[PDB]
Structures are given as structure tokens and as C-alpha cells.
Design a protein around this motif. Structure first.
Motif, mmCIF file in Angstrom:
data_model
loop_
_atom_site.group_PDB
_atom_site.id
_atom_site.type_symbol
_atom_site.label_atom_id
_atom_site.label_comp_id
_atom_site.label_asym_id
_atom_site.label_seq_id
_atom_site.Cartn_x
_atom_site.Cartn_y
_atom_site.Cartn_z
ATOM 1 N N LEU B 84 0.821 -1.205 0.000
ATOM 2 C CA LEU B 84 0.000 0.000 0.000
ATOM 3 C C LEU B 84 0.854 1.254 0.000
ATOM 4 C CD1 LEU B 84 -2.792 -0.930 2.585
ATOM 5 C CD2 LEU B 84 -2.970 -0.921 0.097
ATOM 6 N N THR B 85 2.035 1.199 0.614
ATOM 7 C CA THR B 85 2.958 2.322 0.555
ATOM 8 C C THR B 85 3.532 2.428 -0.848
ATOM 9 O OG1 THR B 85 4.858 1.007 1.278
ATOM 10 C CG2 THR B 85 3.494 2.026 2.978
ATOM 11 N N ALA B 86 3.586 3.645 -1.361
ATOM 12 C CA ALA B 86 3.722 3.868 -2.790
ATOM 13 C C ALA B 86 5.153 3.794 -3.300
ATOM 14 C CB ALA B 86 3.120 5.216 -3.138
ATOM 15 N N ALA B 87 6.096 3.313 -2.496
ATOM 16 C CA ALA B 87 7.366 2.892 -3.066
ATOM 17 C C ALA B 87 7.283 1.462 -3.570
ATOM 18 C CB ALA B 87 8.480 3.032 -2.039
ATOM 19 N N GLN B 106 -3.440 4.801 -9.577
ATOM 20 C CA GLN B 106 -3.381 4.773 -8.126
ATOM 21 C C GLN B 106 -4.752 4.425 -7.561
ATOM 22 O OE1 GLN B 106 -1.723 8.438 -6.751
ATOM 23 N NE2 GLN B 106 0.196 8.185 -7.893
ATOM 24 N N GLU B 108 -6.105 6.498 -4.553
ATOM 25 C CA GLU B 108 -6.452 7.884 -4.245
ATOM 26 C C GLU B 108 -7.355 8.048 -3.025
ATOM 27 O OE1 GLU B 108 -7.984 9.854 -7.692
ATOM 28 O OE2 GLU B 108 -6.173 9.544 -8.887
ATOM 29 N N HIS B 109 -7.877 6.950 -2.485
ATOM 30 C CA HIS B 109 -8.672 6.963 -1.257
ATOM 31 C C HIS B 109 -8.512 5.583 -0.634
ATOM 32 C CE1 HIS B 109 -10.824 10.816 -1.465
ATOM 33 N NE2 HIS B 109 -10.896 10.625 -2.770
ATOM 34 N N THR B 110 -7.607 5.462 0.325
ATOM 35 C CA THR B 110 -7.420 4.204 1.019
ATOM 36 C C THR B 110 -7.618 4.412 2.511
ATOM 37 O OG1 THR B 110 -5.931 2.345 1.394
ATOM 38 C CG2 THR B 110 -4.950 4.500 1.168
ATOM 39 N N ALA B 111 -8.003 3.337 3.189
ATOM 40 C CA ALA B 111 -8.370 3.383 4.598
ATOM 41 C C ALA B 111 -7.880 2.105 5.251
ATOM 42 C CB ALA B 111 -9.883 3.531 4.770
ATOM 43 N N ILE B 112 -6.811 2.207 6.029
ATOM 44 C CA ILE B 112 -6.114 1.045 6.557
ATOM 45 C C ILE B 112 -6.542 0.856 8.002
ATOM 46 C CG2 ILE B 112 -3.916 -0.064 6.828
ATOM 47 C CD1 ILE B 112 -2.842 2.045 4.862
ATOM 48 N N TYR B 115 -3.477 -1.121 11.392
ATOM 49 C CA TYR B 115 -2.243 -1.880 11.350
ATOM 50 C C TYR B 115 -1.339 -1.425 12.484
ATOM 51 C CZ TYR B 115 0.423 2.029 9.286
ATOM 52 O OH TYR B 115 1.051 3.231 9.051
#
Lengths: 307, 135, 50, 50
Positions: B84-87, B106, B108-112, B115
Motif C-alpha cells: 500500500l505504501t507507494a514505493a 493509483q 487515491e482513497h485508502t483506509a487502513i 495496522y
RNA sequence: CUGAUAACUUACAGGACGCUUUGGCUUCAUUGCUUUUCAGGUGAACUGCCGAGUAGGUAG
């Protein structure tokens, strides 16, 4: 010279928002997007993988509305502030202040941190009262460093002489169209400006074609064209032009009013600078740096009241 | 036993203990132990790390000599968060390239949903990563 | 009010930050131009007093 | 179905009636009114003393 | 160490009947809210492996 209860100018330099595009190979453009995380939401904006480089785009007008006050009830305060602009341009001239504003366009000072970790970046200007063959600056990191490198461009005369005529004439216009080309590495950190939230990172955005896109602030952009101020005592870093000129890194005012060289203490000597400029002996460097700063605050605009 | 951290960066302090448990499962190569965080608050880990199924091993002796030590649920690694991290979203493109990358996009709207991270490294290489641990 | 520097405003409290809200309107990115449209009516009401 | 900016009916007719450059020191056309004011520099030309 | 000392006010009860406020009406002429404005702390969380997998798994 006491300040009125109604004084105001308009800005003579008007930027716009900055639009971020992505140029894929096959030479086509798509506006850049970014993410949003919740679990307090932090937005992350990075270059997609297959991209080649990045465009940027905005537009600046040297409207020259600093010639006369926007609103001023006292006529003695109005007649003085008109005579400084007609005496600054006769005895000193707009050439020093036109060059410092135009360097901030013609290198990427308005690209705040996205310059960092780049291979080469280029600027192309589209000036409006102009003949043709758009002015282009190529490979700024190596070719242009010192001011002289800008003056060795084939038309650097012809674009300072727009901004002078835009400030000299009572209806002067001089619209520019700036477009950058940043050659980043793969998957690069890009930093846009970001909203103010009462108290984690929410970007300032617009809508380009039905999609969200990060936009450099319109106010964010003019704050980098106006990084000119290096006339303060024991100056090292040039500052954003303002009254009692702040520095937001180390949260302190240089030109604090106890120094005597903020803007309001130089406005109260506005009659004093008329006799110096109207002699024949060329004035000292200490007393024209007070005038370069005095004109850069009428170009900035603002409200100058008291009581 | 149940270890009490009594000074405190427990998150970063609990994470070194697993590096011993990372290395001790290569001298003897077992996996017969269990991991249990009893005081799993919704902010921290808590000063109780416990091994269920150490106390005489080289790291924990010098830890115990100073005045600070005493020596259902599913604590599983979740490396779907790591993409999920964009690297890692662009690593994942170079994986699946083996074609148009521009039609990928991408989220553009994520909800974790809660964690939790504990930062570590490798020892063959000089390379860092995260031990993402949830319930 | 009198004219001297106030002594509360030291260099830290005068370089601080000032948040303000404004309505911001502007032309969209790839528009062509802007239309405006209104209407006037010249209607002879000055001939006699209402 | 959306809000939109507008130029006020009274703001618009204040532009059609900027005619008055017959005041005694005439350079700039003023908005027509009783004791013709100038909103730039806050004074009445055509003051009742004149 | 009190206009001191002491102190049972009681018992019963039917307010009712009736009641058309109506008629008429012109609030209205006139109008410039503006000037200016950096949210930052993004060096952290990497680079592989299986799978047709933009799903999902796994190593250190």
C-alpha cells in the motif's frame, strides 16, 4: 509623515495556480494525482513508473498598478507616494528590480523542493506583447547559476524591457506564460502546497479534467517570485518581501521595528527620499537599498493604515 | 516468561527482542514458539512482551543486570500493507511487466484499519523493512 | 495608538502566522474564454415625477 | 444546479452611469450622483460649498 | 426566669337558565463592500519470490 486611516494598494504581479502534468512517452499529457490515507489523513504524491518527465504551468502579469494608491483619503499622502515612483524610475530605474523578479521565474525558484533530485529542468516563456519564437532556458542546473548566465541568453534584454515598460507606462500589461520540464528519477517525491487545518497532511488541489490534482498555491507561487529581500543588516539569505520582513525557518523578524528598517519606518521618511533623489550626486548604496525595498512593498500591495 | 519494560520506547524496544528470536531460529532452526502481546492498546504495544510455547541468552543477560527487567488472538505478519505504501506500487509494476503501464493508476482513497509497525533490518544485506503486526 | 513600538510584539510574536479565509474564483485550466450576459432597459421615467 | 458568481445589479448600473466629468476640476469621469463622490480618494467633488 | 404558669372551635351544604360583532381599504420611490496573504515538520517502511492474477500470498 503620519499614515492615514484609509490606505491600500493592489499588487502589480499576479500569479495563478500551478498545474502538474505527466508526459508519458508517445508524448501525451495526463494530470498528476495523489493518495489519501485514513486509519487524520496524509496525502502522498509521487511520479508514476512509466513516465518520462513532468510539465508545470502558470501565468504572471506585471500589471504595474503600483503607479498610484488604490484608495487614500488624505491627498498629501497620495501626492507624496506618486512622486516616489516617478523619481525612482528617473534616477534609479526599474532595471534592478525587474531582473530579480524575472530570475525567480526563469529558474525554478517557484518550484520549491521538486527541483531537488532532478537531472535537468528547463523553462519556456511565452511573452504576450511579443513577436515570436518563444524564449527558452535549457538545462538550468549547469548552464544557468550566476546572473550573467541569464544575460548571455540571446534575448534577455527584450524581456526585462517589457517589465520596465509595464512598470513605466500608466497602462502597462506584460503577461507571461511559464512552462517547466522536470526530468526526475524514477518514482520521485513531489511536494505540492497543502491546506491549513486547525489542530495531518492534506494537499491543496483543484479539478483539471474530472480528476483531483495537486496545485502549487496561487499565493504559494507569488511568495517565490518575491524572494528578493537581501537588503537587511548583515544579510546572507534573500527573504520574501514583506513588512518587517519575517523568516519562517528560524521564526524571527529581520527588519524588526527596533532596527528602524521595517517598511513603516521608511514610509515615514518618504519626503526625506525626495530631496536625495532630486539632486545630481548619485546616492549611496545604503540609501537606494532602502528604495529598492520601498518599491517592492508597493508592488506587493497591502493595507497601510493606522489608528 | 512475561517481560516487563520498566523505565520508554517499548515499540522500538520490543522490536529488538524479536531480532534475537530471528537469529536464534537459525542456530537451532525451530518454529515451535508463540508470540503474544497481552496489553495491545490501540496506541502502543505495552510493556509486556511474552514468549509462549530466552531468559539465559546473550542479549537478555546484560539487559537483566541493570535495574530494569523482570524477564483467542492472531498476531500475524501482514505484508499486504507493505504494498500500500507507494514505493512498492512501482516495484509491483516491474514484477507484472514480465503492455501499458499508463493504464495502471493509483487508488487515491485508502483506509487502513488499524495496522501496527515495528521497524527492523536484514543481516545478509544492509536493508531495512517493517514487521507489520495486527490482530 | 501613539506611535511607539508596542513591547509585547517581539521578533518571535511578530513572525508567527496569520490564517484567514477568502473566496477564490478563477478560470479553469483548459477553457477558451468567459461569457457574460446582462440587459439594460432605457424607459423614459424622467419626464414627470413619480 | 450550482452556485455561480454574479456582478450586482447595482454594481452594474454604477458603471453605465460613470459620466460625470463636468465637476470644476474635471479629469476622471465620476459616477453620477448628488454631490458627486469619488470612491478612490474619499472626497466629494461638487460639495455643497462649491 | 418571656401581659408569666395552664389551653382541641367544631359540626352540615347543588348557583343556574338564554345569547349572530359587523361593514370598507394600493406602502413605495433610490443605491459599487473592498485592499493583502507560503501550513509545514514526507531524508521514514526495503527488494525480491509464486501465480493469468491491478485479487491474494509469502521471505529478511
Amino acid at each position: 509623515m503620519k499614515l492615514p486611516t484609509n490606505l491600500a494598494y493592489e499588487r502589480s504581479i499576479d500569479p495563478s495556480d500551478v498545474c502538474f502534468f505527466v508526459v508519458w512517452p508517445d508524448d501525451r499529457k495526463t494530470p498528476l494525482t495523489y493518495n489519501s490515507r485514513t486509519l487524520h489523513q496524509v496525502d502522498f504524491c509521487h511520479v508514476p513508473y512509466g513516465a518520462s518527465h513532468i510539465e508545470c504551468s502558470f501565468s504572471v502579469s506585471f500589471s504595474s498598478e503600483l503607479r498610484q494608491p488604490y484608495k487614500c483619503n488624505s491627498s498629501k499622502v497620495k501626492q507624496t507616494l506618486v512622486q516616489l515612483v516617478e523619481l525612482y524610475e528617473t534616477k534609479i530605474g526599474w532595471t534592478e528590480l525587474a531582473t530579480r523578479y524575472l530570475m525567480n521565474i526563469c529558474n525554478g525558484k517557484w518550484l520549491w523542493k521538486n527541483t531537488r533530485k532532478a537531472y535537468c529542468w528547463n523553462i519556456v516563456l511565452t511573452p504576450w506583447p511579443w513577436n515570436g519564437e518563444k524564449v527558452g532556458f535549457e538545462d538550468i542546473r549547469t548552464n544557468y547559476t550566476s546572473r550573467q548566465d541569464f544575460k548571455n541568453n540571446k534575448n534577455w534584454s527584450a524581456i526585462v524591457e517589457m517589465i520596465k515598460t509595464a512598470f513605466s507606462s500608466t497602462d502597462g500589461l506584460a503577461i507571461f506564460e511559464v512552462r517547466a520540464t522536470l526530468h526526475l528519477p524514477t518514482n520521485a517525491m513531489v511536494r505540492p502546497s497543502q491546506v491549513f487545518t486547525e489542530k495531518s497532511r492534506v494537499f491543496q488541489s483543484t479539478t483539471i479534467d474530472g480528476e483531483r490534482s495537486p496545485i502549487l498555491g496561487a499565493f504559494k507561487t507569488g511568495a517565490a517570485i518575491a524572494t528578493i529581500d537581501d537588503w537587511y543588516p548583515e544579510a546572507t539569505e534573500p527573504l520574501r518581501v514583506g513588512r518587517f520582513g519575517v523568516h519562517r525557518e528560524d521564526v524571527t523578524c529581520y527588519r524588526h521595528p527596533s532596527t528602524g528598517k521595517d517598511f513603516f519606518s521608511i514610509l515615514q521618511q518618504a519626503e526625506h527620499y525626495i530631496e536625495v533623489l532630486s539632486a545630481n550626486k548619485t546616492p549611496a548604496q545604503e540609501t537606494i537599498n532602502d528604495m529598492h525595498f520601498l518599491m517592492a512593498n508597493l508592488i506587493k500591495g497591502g493595507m497601510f493604515q493606522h489608528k | 516468561k512475561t517481560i516487563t519494560f520498566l523505565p520508554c520506547n517499548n515499540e522500538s524496544l520490543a522490536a529488538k527482542c524479536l531480532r534475537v528470536l530471528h537469529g536464534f531460529n537459525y542456530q537451532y532452526e525451530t518454529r515451535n514458539i508463540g508470540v503474544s502481546f497481552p496489553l495491545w492498546c490501540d496506541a502502543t504495544v505495552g510493556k509486556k512482551i511474552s514468549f509462549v510455547s530466552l531468559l539465559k541468552q546473550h542479549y537478555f543477560v546484560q539487559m537483566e543486570q541493570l535495574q530494569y527487567f523482570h524477564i483467542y488472538v492472531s498476531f500475524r505478519r501482514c505484508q499486504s500493507i507493505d504494498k500500500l505504501t507507494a514505493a512498492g506500487l512501482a516495484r509491483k509494476i516491474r514484477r507484472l511487466e514480465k503492455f501499458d503501464p499508463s493504464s495502471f493508476a493509483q487508488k487515491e482513497h485508502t483506509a487502513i484499519a488499524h495496522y501496527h509497525s515495528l521497524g527492523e533490518s536484514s543481516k545478509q544485506t544492509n536493508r531495512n523493512f517493517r514487521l507489520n503486526i495486527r490482530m | 495608538v501613539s506611535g511607539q513600538p508596542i513591547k509585547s510584539a517581539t521578533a518571535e510574536a511578530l513572525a508567527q502566522g496569520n490564517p484567514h479565509q477568502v473566496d477564490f474564483c478563477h478560470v479553469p485550466y483548459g477553457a477558451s474564454h468567459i461569457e457574460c450576459s446582462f440587459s439594460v432597459s432605457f424607459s423614459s421615467e424622467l419626464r414627470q415625477p413619480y
